Amino acid sequence: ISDNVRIKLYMEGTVNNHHFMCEAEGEGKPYEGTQMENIKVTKGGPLPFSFDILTPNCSVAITKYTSGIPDYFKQSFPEGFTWERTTIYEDGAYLTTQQETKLDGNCLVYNIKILGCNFPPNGPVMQKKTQGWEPCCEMRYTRDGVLCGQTLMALKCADGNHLTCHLRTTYRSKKAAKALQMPPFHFSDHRPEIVKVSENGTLFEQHESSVARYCQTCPSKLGHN
Amino acid sequence: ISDNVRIKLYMEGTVNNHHFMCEAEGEGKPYEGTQMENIKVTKGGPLPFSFDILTPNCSVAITKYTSGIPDYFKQSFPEGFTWERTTIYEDGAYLTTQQETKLDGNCLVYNIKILGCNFPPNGPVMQKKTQGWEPCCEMRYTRDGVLCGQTLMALKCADGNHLTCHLRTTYRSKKAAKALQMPPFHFSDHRPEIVKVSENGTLFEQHESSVARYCQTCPSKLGHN
Amino acid sequence: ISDNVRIKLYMEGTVNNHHFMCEAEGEGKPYEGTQMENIKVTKGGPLPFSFDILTPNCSVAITKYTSGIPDYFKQSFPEGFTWERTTIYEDGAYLTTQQETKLDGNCLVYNIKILGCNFPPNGPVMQKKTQGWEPCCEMRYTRDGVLCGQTLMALKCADGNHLTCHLRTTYRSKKAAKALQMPPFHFSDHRPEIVKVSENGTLFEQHESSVARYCQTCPSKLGHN
Amino acid sequence: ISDNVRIKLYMEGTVNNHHFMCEAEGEGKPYEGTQMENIKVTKGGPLPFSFDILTPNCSVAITKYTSGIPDYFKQSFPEGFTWERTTIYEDGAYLTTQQETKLDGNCLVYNIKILGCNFPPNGPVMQKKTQGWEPCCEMRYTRDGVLCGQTLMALKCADGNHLTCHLRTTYRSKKAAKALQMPPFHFSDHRPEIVKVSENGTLFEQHESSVARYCQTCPSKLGHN
Amino acid sequence: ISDNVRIKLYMEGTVNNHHFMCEAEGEGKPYEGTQMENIKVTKGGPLPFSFDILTPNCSVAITKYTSGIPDYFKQSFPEGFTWERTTIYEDGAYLTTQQETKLDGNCLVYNIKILGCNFPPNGPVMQKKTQGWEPCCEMRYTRDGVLCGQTLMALKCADGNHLTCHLRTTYRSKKAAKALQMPPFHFSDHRPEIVKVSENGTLFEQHESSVARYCQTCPSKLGHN
Amino acid sequence: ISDNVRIKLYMEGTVNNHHFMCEAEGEGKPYEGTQMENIKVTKGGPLPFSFDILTPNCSVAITKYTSGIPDYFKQSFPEGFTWERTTIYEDGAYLTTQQETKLDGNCLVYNIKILGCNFPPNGPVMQKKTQGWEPCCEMRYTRDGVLCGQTLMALKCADGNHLTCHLRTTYRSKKAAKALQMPPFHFSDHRPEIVKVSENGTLFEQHESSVARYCQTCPSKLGHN
Amino acid sequence: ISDNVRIKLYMEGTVNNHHFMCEAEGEGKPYEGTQMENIKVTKGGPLPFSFDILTPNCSVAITKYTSGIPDYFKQSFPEGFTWERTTIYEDGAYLTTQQETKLDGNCLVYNIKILGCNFPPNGPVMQKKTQGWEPCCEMRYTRDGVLCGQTLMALKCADGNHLTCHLRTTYRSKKAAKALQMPPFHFSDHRPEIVKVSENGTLFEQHESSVARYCQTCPSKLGHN
Amino acid sequence: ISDNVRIKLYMEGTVNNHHFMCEAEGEGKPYEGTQMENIKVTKGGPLPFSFDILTPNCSVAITKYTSGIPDYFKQSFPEGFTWERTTIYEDGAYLTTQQETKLDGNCLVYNIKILGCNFPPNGPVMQKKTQGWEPCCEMRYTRDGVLCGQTLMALKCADGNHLTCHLRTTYRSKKAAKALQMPPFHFSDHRPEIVKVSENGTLFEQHESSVARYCQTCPSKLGHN
């Protein structure tokens, strides 16, 4: 994959019985781990809920993989990969996502499907009281030939509280495991941020930085990473 | 709704990155709570996973509502209703469903969308080692003007074990709450059974009985139901 | 075990950093599945939380086992048994219990240890706005030589809503599994009720009825129980 | 609190009906965030399960708090603090902890109570197949005037696999709110390691390093921490 | 009045049937128009609504009166004054205030009574979605021998929108009319800001600056102020 | 509630900076909708304003509810209810009320708080030129689980003129919404009259009749009430 | 005026910048207070908002004037009259109307001008979610030689909720007040209903019944109307 | 838009049943915010009421927009814009306006429609006892993709009084959302003055200055505008 790529996104979903569609165009630097997307709600907008719950569904090939840790995603090209995830919110809401990622030339194409349910009508998401995500730390490890990820995230609320959730992901390379260098357990920091909202809450400029690493602040007494 | 109805079902989903579609034809006695469907996997079959996980997604308007408990579903007609649910398996798999139910004459039409993820490849579902569901007891109660349901189910496994899961559902009538007689807290027994599999594992004859009731084995010292 | 037995209970626990102890004396009809206990909060009372969360922790040897289903608990005497459980509330609270049951003469003696955490201070439990439990249906199945149980329960709230939780239990007979007739998958209905509260909310008269059974509302078309 | 302190620990617990007690003596540098403890299983040892599940229960006053982030724990002395936690394992096990932390002289004294249940008998924990924890990243945020923490951890298994769990903690200062400066949302890295096992599997030399910080790998484009 | 003063405040109110009391200690520079208050919700806190609605009720003797405009408030000492006001929110809520202001030595003492009603439960105030007030411009004019004020204010919401309201005030000097120089029509800019929230949302550090003036951005073609 | 009840009232308020208190003893026939109160101004009398503005603040449990329309107020006992209201006068005055209603045996107890402001000094109220209220028609409808009311009223002046006002009320039952039969849109006619004034304008014998009904003069062509 | 008349109406207006024109043909029985009009949107239809807001603008000479109450409108012929009104909706919308009424032979001719503004785009009116008006009660009283009217009305919504508004009207006879018998304070019930919609939502069959009266449900102790 | 423009205005209205028309020729400097118009009452003049109520209806494209605040009005050219407003007077009068603004070359063309009602006959407006407007401060904020404005104004009265009113405006650009940069919350000062009246009270020379800005007199302690 190139050091500079374009991004094209297509999303379709139903949350609490509300159908919607989104499309986005963006750019990013795969090896630097930085990127940005201009996401437009093409159908069903303005959404009856905070766009925040859609943010993390909109790019793991773009991450600075450090410490010699094998990059499961960049290794997957040209074949590409898909990933699936369920996000469990502390107030009972569930959001499941199926995504396909393809690399056509220097353009990353994302096709996303989402199904969300049980979001409380008077909760922060449905009441649009949330104000973006705190950065997070994803735990990555292999299992049964695929790469798994788990993360705890926190939505900022106007009152100062946070609404937390748990992401459980399975990343699936289109390359056979035999053709891949599987990575050891490691982490990936992510910082998604919406820097601008326009067109009556239907257009969002979203930026994100990601870095894969080992625990660097606490030294091992046993020579482990 | 009449005493005898026809059932037409359309389903589309992706589980562990495997896309599939199903269509069914059936019948049922709404007030007797008995029904049967002939479900055909029209695309993506035979499925690489046990059809058992799709079974509970294929009819709550057909239930013998006893003890004078108001029937939230039959009351929603002719407008109909929709429901959303996430099923959490004990081995980490999640399956989210979005469904729409409408009544055309004396025919119930179901449109279903499913997204499933994280099913362990060596688990009983992906290995097709499950052998049907044990009967179950659903807990139903109102909240925020809609009807909620929660159930623990158990899939019989060939090794003698049971694989358990937790269903969390929100049923949404298309009629305004004020035009409905909301039910008190109650239960609903369900007994889905596959009696025949044919056409190279793509046609499933599925029967089911459902009965809404109160606890009927434990007396109350306070006269409560 | 006899047709009528006495009950002596000792409980110690800490919930949200509040330490407390309870003692109770009661009676029951093991085969009839009916019982009553006069539970006194001996230390740390009045509790800063609803007594309702302790109710389900205060007697499975007392249950009417029907349909020829082997009784794992009564079979365990005179040796007795222990059980361990964690209850997960929908608003983030957890309550773990460890219990020992023995039969001394004609008296069932219960020794209970409880640790609870993360109960929301503005929640119905910590605000004492709950009004007893709704009857429930426990799912029972064997696994690895022991008997397991899972149940969803709902706490009635003052505002009319229900607070739901999930119980995950493991019952351990003190007799070697070898000397026991392990039961098939089955259910158990429970109806715990507090009929009187006195001594400034430190004494509770609690009654309960339990019945072990199979699904008796939905006939099986495959000849299964 | 002194920059050099000793540690004294007392633990009692029951896991899968196995009762045990532990005691430890150690030392640490509160502001450097480094520490070591010699933990002896004084009763019920050698344990019938991996000591790994006990490891994370044995010291948050010892953490290097960087970036001027208010230190909830060090601000709590001399009054001290307590914390409560439930750890949920992916294979159904639950472990709940209640802890009290006091400073006697220049020695941190820990009193721990543990209740564990539903650990699978043939699982890696009960089979003693785990090989310590991977380092972890805890999410810390305020709620209801106290400090909350949530973490995802992973046990290393022989197969090269990992067994994951989720920690949900509430830290409770015994100091007046008026005398405490609460921290903003932040993280704390922890790396607990058993560097030596002796005395026939009953003595564990455990080291740990902890660092509280903001996300430093991913720059904010909104000027946030 | 001194160039520097202390502030002491006592408030009692009921909003949407929720009773509360507040007390505050602060300081200000009467002639510079700047001040600060540390407001504690002594009873009924944390409030079930945004503290923002209470902010503007908490100091008109502290304002920089420019352009030779007579200062109705400072002229009122030592007698002091009272003021009454009703704030009408665009979504149907009303909040009425009665206030007494006295000068005790170097301390301005405020006694406030508040009654609020009809705030929508899912509105920004009851949902705590607001994030402070935008600065505002008060219109001041004499009528029936007293000073009247009217102002349009706007609360900032998490979503980027604003919730507006209308303040209608009557200021009543306790000084004999014959001893007061009544001011001509003029404006007063106000900028209340909460710079810190602590003690579980019950302690607010609030600052404010106020300036009385004529319209200086648009010249008069008739020589009027 | 009984067919014949006693009434005890306690009132405290401040209008245009004039503090006052009232107390009353009365009787009524709840189902007949008739009642009387002997209201005494216990502090601040004679009032510097017409007692007419206090009249409508002095009993909604007493109303003849016709046509099978559910009675929100009588249904609220024994718990009782509260109500809040703001009355907006055409000449700029505002009067806000908070009231609590309890039933003790057959005695209705009212506790009222009032804050009024901006009444013009030369208007009919402050000049005590009003001569009672014309009967009025209240509009009642539910919203967000509570009962709302709105009414336009008119004070009579000797010259044949009227001074109008707008009442905006929220009635809040102390019973759970689930335990109440909510009424459809309807009206309530009210006719308050002061039949005797004594003790130098500090004791008022006030009578009132109230009837809840649908529109009975204009038949519906669509079969609506 | 005769007991059976024809009705002809011409209307032009702009609401939220949408221009439209309407024309109607109908009939009414002046003394019976009943009438019906076939209202056609001749320009700008189908309207981008609910026709419901236009309904009350389409006949006060048609009202059953009971109880000997002087009929300001009937007395105005042959000269006729005009009326002006502003309707204030609770969600911030305003609609102002200017109307002229003349009698040509036995045909009442109405010429209407309307300007509406600030209707929320997502409100029930602009979204066409309203379902007609509930009947209402107008307060009528004289002032400065003319007749005034004020009414609160409520639009019905599907949820069972209502959108309320306030009408403030001034009726102006073309006859000199000297030649008219002015009425005392009284009421007028109105019940507008759309019984048929056709021609792609541009033709509305609307009927209405009106009755002028005094309060007839609450007898007066003092002897007032 | 040019730095120097001409103005052409056409107005038609009906206030308290009095029909009138006006036309004007003017000029202004859009970026400097200064302008003048020579307004002639072409029909229905001299008006039976104060021309002051028409003054604010006669130019928002002419305003000095400072501090980098996006200019909604100038951005709207060449397409143009419209605006709608209702002005509510404290003595019960309402005046609604609909306006269209076009830029033909360097000439701004205004087409204005007005409907006013309920002005008291003995009030200052109808008696022509007003002496021009005091300058004012408009609050501007976006909502639903359009620009809203609200302002309180004060008309100079006879005996040294002021008659106040509230303006509620919606400004509608003819450009699409994608082609506009929406402004943050801000203010606009306005100072309309009649400097000459001639031709028997039918020709008015009116000047005005407007400035859009943030609050500059009161510093923010949080770095907000």
Interface test mutation site (partner D, options C94, C114, C150, max chain D beta carbons within 10 A): C94
Hey, what's the torsion of the CAs at E68, E69, E74, E76, to 10 degrees?
130
H-run or E-run covering E75:
helix E72-75
Residues in chain D: 225
Contact residues, chain C, for F177 at CB < 8 Å? 159-160
Residues contacting residue E46 through CB under 8 Å, at least 6 positions apart: E200, E201, E202
Q: Under an 8 A CB cutoff, do D117 and C96 touch?
A: yes
Nearest to G20 by CA among G49, G44, G56, G47: G44
On chain F, the residues whose CB falls within 8 A of the CB of E120 are 144
Residue of B nearest to C224 (CA): B134
Pairwise CA distance, residues H187 & F93, whole Å: 28
Residue with tokens 């989210």: B96
- Is there a contact between D208 and D34 (Cβ–Cβ < 8 Å)? yes
C-alpha distances in Å from residue F12, one per residue of E18, E66, F20, F99, F111? 18, 40, 6, 11, 8
Give all chains having 3 or more CB-to-CB distances under 8 Å with chain E: A, D, F, H
The residue ranges of DSSP E strands in chain E, in sequence order, are 5-15, 18-29, 34-43, 64-65, 81-89, 94-104, 107-117, 130-133, 136-143, 146-157, 162-173, 186-190, 193-198, 203-213
CA pair distance B148, B84, nearest whole angstrom: 10
| Interchain pair H145, A198: CB under 8 A | no
| Contact residues on chain A for H177, CB-CB shorter than 8 A | 198-200
Give, in order, the Cα–Cα distances in Å from D119 to each of A144, C64, C113, C152, D134: 22, 29, 18, 20, 20
- Judge: C159–F177 Cβ closer than 8 Å, yes or no: yes
Provide the residue type at H92 as one letter.
Answer: G
CA distance B33 to B192: 12
CB C33 within 8 A of CB C64: yes
C-beta of residue E37 within 8 angstroms of C-beta of residue E24: yes
Could you identify the residue written with the tokens 């506009």? H180
Pick the residue from chain B with its C-alpha nearest to C35.
Answer: B221
CA–CA distance, A79 with A119 (Å, rounded to integer)? 36
Q: Which of A37, A53, A52 is nearest to A207 (CA)?
A: A37
CA–CA distance, F87 with H166 (Å, rounded to integer): 19
User: Apex CA G44: angle with CA G42 and CA G50, to 5°?
Assistant: 100
Q: What is the resolution of this structure in A?
A: 1.8
Which residues of chain H make contact with G11, given a CB cutoff of 8 A?
none
Q: Report chain H residues whose CB lies below 8 A from the CB of E170.
A: none
Domain count, chain A: 1
Q: C94: closest CA among C30, C165, C153?
A: C165
- Judged by CB atoms closer than 8 Å, whether chains meet at B117 and A16 is answered as no
Contacts C160 to F, Cβ<8 Å: 176-179
String of DSSP letters for D143-167: ETTEEEEEEEEEEEETTS-EEEEEE
Quote the CA–CA distance of E127 and H218 in Å, as a whole number: 29
Chains that touch G (3 or more CB pairs under 8 A): B, F, H
Q: What are phi and psi of C35, to 5 degrees?
A: -160, 165
Q: Quick check: F17 and E85 CB within 8 A? A: no
In total, the C-beta contacts within 8 angstroms joining chain A to chain C are 3
- At E74, which helix (H) or strand (E)? helix E72-75
Task: Pick from H90, H97, H167, H170 the residue to mutate for testing the G interface (most G CBs within 10 Å).
Answer: H170
Beta strands in chain D (DSSP E): 5-15, 18-29, 34-43, 64-65, 81-89, 94-104, 107-117, 130-133, 136-143, 146-157, 162-173, 186-190, 193-198, 203-213
Chain A 14-73, residues with CB within 8 Å of chain B CB atoms? 14, 16-17
Picking from A162, F160, C63, the residue whose alpha carbon sits closest to that of residue D150 is: A162
> Which member of B185, B211, B217 has the closest CB to residue C213?
B217
Residues of chain E with Cβ-Cβ distance to F168 below 8 Å are 92, 94, 117-118
Residue (of H182, H84, H99, H86) closest to H142 by Cα position: H182
Q: How many CB atoms lie within 10 A of CB E17?
A: 18
Report the alpha-carbon distance of residue G37 to residue F48 in Å, rounded.
53
Tokens, residue E203: 């302690």
Spell out the residues 6+ positions from residue A60 whose beta carbon is closer than 8 angstroms to its own: A73, A83, A101, A171, A210
Phi then psi dihedrals of residue A161, to 5 deg: -75, 175
Nearest alpha-carbon partner for D180 in D188, D171, D189: D171
CB D97 within 8 A of CB D112: yes
3-state class (DSSP) for residue E169: strand
* CATH at residue E102: 2.40.155.10
Q: For residue A89, what are its two tokens?
A: 């919110």
Q: In angstroms, rounded to a whole number, what is the distance separating the alpha carbons of residues F22 and F9? A: 8
Going from the C-alpha of C172 to that of each of B185, C31, C81, the distances in angstroms are 32, 20, 6
The DSSP call for residue F76 is: G
Residue count of chain B, please give it.
Answer: 225
What are the backbone dihedrals phi and psi of residue B215, each rounded to the nearest 5 degrees, phi first? -65, 135
Q: Which class for B31: exposed (0-12), middle (13-18), buried (19 or more C-beta within 10 A)?
A: middle
Neighbours of C47 (CB within 10 A): 17
Do B36 and B52 contact (CB within 8 A), yes or no?
no
Q: Are G6 and G27 in contact (CB under 8 A)?
A: yes
Indicate the SS3 state at residue F62.
coil
Provide the domain limits for residue C195: 1-225
Q: Is C137 left (phi over 0), alpha (psi -120 to 50) or beta?
A: beta
H helices, E strands: number in chain G: 0, 14
Instruction: Give me the residue label for tokens 């009660």.
Output: G137
Query: Rounded to an integer, what distance in angstroms lies between the CA atom of residue G208 and that of residue G190?
Result: 7
- Identify which of H177, H166, H170 has the alpha carbon closest to the alpha carbon of residue H149: H170
How far is the C-alpha of A18 from the C-alpha of A116, rounded, in Å? 9
Distance from CA of C123 to the nearest CA of A (A): 13
The reply to whether residue E117 touches residue F144, judged by beta carbons under 8 angstroms, is no
Show the CA angle centred on residue C87, arms to residues C86 and C88, nearest 5°. Answer: 115
Q: Which residue of C has its CA nearest to D81?
A: C17
Please tell me the distance from the alpha carbon of residue A84 to that of residue A148, in angstroms, as a whole number: 10
Shortest distance between the Cα of A38 and any Cα of chain H, in A, equals 13
Q: Quick check: bond before D120 cis, omega within 30?
A: no
Chain breaks in chain A (C to N over 2.5 A) after: 58
Q: Given CB atoms, is H218 within the 8 Å cutoff of chain A?
A: no
Q: Give the closest of A85, A118, A122 to B117, CB-based.
A: A85
Q: E200 to chain D: which residues are within 8 Å by CB?
A: 144-145, 177
Residue of C nearest to A165 (CA): C92
Q: How far is Cα D14 from Cα D34, in angstroms, rounded to an integer?
A: 29
Q: Which residue carries 């005179």 as its tokens?
A: C78
CB contacts of D98 in chain C (<8 Å) are 14, 17, 115, 117
The alpha-carbon gap from A42 to the nearest alpha carbon of chain E, in Å, equals 19
Which residues sit opposite E138 in a β-bridge?
A: E151, E188
Q: How far is CA G94 from the centre of its chain?
A: 16
Question: What is the helix (H) or strand (E) element at residue G95, kind and residue range?
Answer: strand G94-104
Chains that touch B (3 or more CB pairs under 8 A): A, C, G
Across-strand partners of F188? Answer: F138, F212
Any CB–CB contact under 8 A between B94 and chain A? Answer: yes
Three-class secondary structure of residue E190 per DSSP: strand
Inter-residue contact F211 to F187 (CB < 8 Å): no
Instruction: For residue B106, report the phi and psi dihedrals to the nearest 5 degrees.
Output: -115, 30
Q: Which chains touch F (3 or more CB pairs under 8 A)?
A: C, E, G
Distance CA H14, CA H19 (A): 4
CB contact burial B82-107 (16+ within 10 A = b; e otherwise): bbbbbbbbbbbbbbbbbbbbbbeeee
Q: What is the dihedral of CA E55, E56, E61, E64, to 10 degrees?
A: 100
Which residues have a Cβ under 8 Å from the Cβ of G8 and sit 6 or more positions away? G24, G25, G107, G108, G109, G110
Instruction: Give the torsion sign (CA, A33, A37, A41, A46).
Output: positive
Nearest in space to E167 (alpha carbons), one of E85, E112, E84, E93? E85
Q: Chains E/H: 3 or more C-beta pairs closer than 8 A?
A: yes
Q: Is G160 on the interface with B (CB under 8 A)?
A: yes
Gap between the Cα atoms of D146 and D182, Å rounded? 8
Percent of chain B as helix, strand, coil, to the nearest 5: 5, 55, 40
Select from D134, D219, D221 the Cβ nearest to the Cβ of A195: D221
Distance, in Å, from the CA atom of E138 to the CA atom of E73, rounded to the nearest integer, reads: 15
Q: D178 and E200: CB-CB below 8 Å?
A: no
Is H182 an 8 Å CB contact of chain A?
yes
Please tell me which residue of chain B has the smallest CA distance to G158: B176
DSSP characters for chain A? Answer: --SSEEEEEEEEEEETTEEEEEEEEEEEETTTTEEEEEEEEEESPSPSS-GGGTGGG--TTS-EE-TT---HHHHTTTT-EEEEEEEEETTS-EEEEEEEEEEETTEEEEEEEEEEE---TTSTTTTT-EEEEPPEEEEEEEETTEEEEEEEEEEEETTS-EEEEEEEEEEEESS-GGGS----SEEEEEEEEEEEEETTTTEEEEEEEEEEE---SS--SSS--
Q: What string of DSSP letters covers G37-48?
A: EEEEEEES-S-S
